[PDB]
Amino acid sequence: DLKAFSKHIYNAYLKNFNMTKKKARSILTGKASHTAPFVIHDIETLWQAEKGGLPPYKEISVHVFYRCQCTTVETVRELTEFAKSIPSFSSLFLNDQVTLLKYGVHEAIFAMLASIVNKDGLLVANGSGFVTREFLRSLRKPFSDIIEPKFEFAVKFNALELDDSDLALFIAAIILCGDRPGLMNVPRVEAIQDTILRALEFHLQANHPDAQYLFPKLLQKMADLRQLVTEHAQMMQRIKKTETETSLHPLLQEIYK
Ligand SMILES: O=C(O)CCCCCOc1ccccc1CN(C(=O)c1ccc(-c2ccccc2F)cc1)C1CC1
Ligand SMILES: CCCCCCCO[C@@H]1O[C@H](CO)[C@@H](O)[C@H](O)[C@H]1O
Ligand SMILES: CCCCCCCO[C@@H]1O[C@H](CO)[C@@H](O)[C@H](O)[C@H]1O
């Protein structure tokens, strides 16, 4: 049953991800709690944020880079358990599960990223802090170059105004993608992806009645995410080749192997 298929993915989304877009958006607006997030806009406030774990300190731009690794790695662990909560996904052999996570987590991460982003920055520390975009721009290359492209995508992505129910299905479609290199059972995954996209279109018709061309637009965003991630990978291989003092989390090294 497709209606129940969708609802199961929605529950897995709520059960496995720390913050919903509804949570984040209320913070970024200021309705939620009378204590707004602590703004990190420069070195001082960055230091104050740390006061109130990671590899040896090298410098500020690299410190930010490590904080980013921690969030990506943490989000990978949530995507893994969210995917595992999808019965269709757990029926695949374990190696096929790894292939899809290896080549899908980053696409899923930059799509979820938009939920905690606005034109001015993003949330950190579970909504307790807000890092400004101008500050992340002030970092030295190539760390400023690896951050700014995501904001440009996030702002155009938020213009679609998806709610958490849309995103749950949207993320499952990104993970269950038959195009990944080295997949063993392509037709199985192709079928699963087709069921999700069908349920996604069915969902959007109900959830966004007066939103036209929303489904083809999201398919275009999926294509955009492949471009964004591929560019991100090149910049990562740049850091690995030119930033000797910058280490990489082993899990991410396996993804970029
Ligand atoms: O290849 C990989 O996967 C690793 C390299 C990723 C580097 C690029 O990361 C990004 C690019 C654009 C936008 C956001 C991010 C990082 N993310 C965060 O949520 C996030 C977390 C913490 C801080 C932050 C905390 C305290 C002090 C200053 C900080 F900057 C900032 C952003 C997204 C999960 C990817
Ligand atoms: C199901 C448990 C037994 C699984 C044994 C099959 C191992 O396959 C390996 O899967 C990896 C991606 O997942 C690839 O990177 C490797 O090249 C491939 O050799
Ligand atoms: C939690 C899983 C998400 C992270 C996936 C990382 C997978 O890395 C790959 O694992 C394969 C066998 O495990 C190796 O054959 C590949 O060389 C390696 O690139």
Residue 212, domain extent: 1-257
What separation in Å is there between the alpha carbon of 173 and the centre of ligand 1? Answer: 23
Q: How many domains does the chain have?
A: 1
Q: Is 132 left (phi over 0), alpha (psi -120 to 50) or beta?
A: beta
Q: Confirm or reject: Cβ of 228 under 6 Å from ligand 1.
A: no
Resolution of the solved structure (Å): 2.2
What CATH code is carried by the domain that includes residue 14? 1.10.565.10
What separation in Å is there between the alpha carbon of 147 and the centre of ligand 1? Answer: 7
Task: Give the pairing of strands 38-40 and 117-118.
Answer: unpaired
Which residues does ligand 2 sit against, CB inside 6 Å? Answer: 93-95, 98-99, 182
Q: Confirm or reject: Cβ of 111 under 6 Å from ligand 3.
A: no
Residues 81, 105: Cα–Cα separation, whole Å: 12
Q: Confirm or reject: Cβ of 169 under 6 Å from ligand 1.
A: no
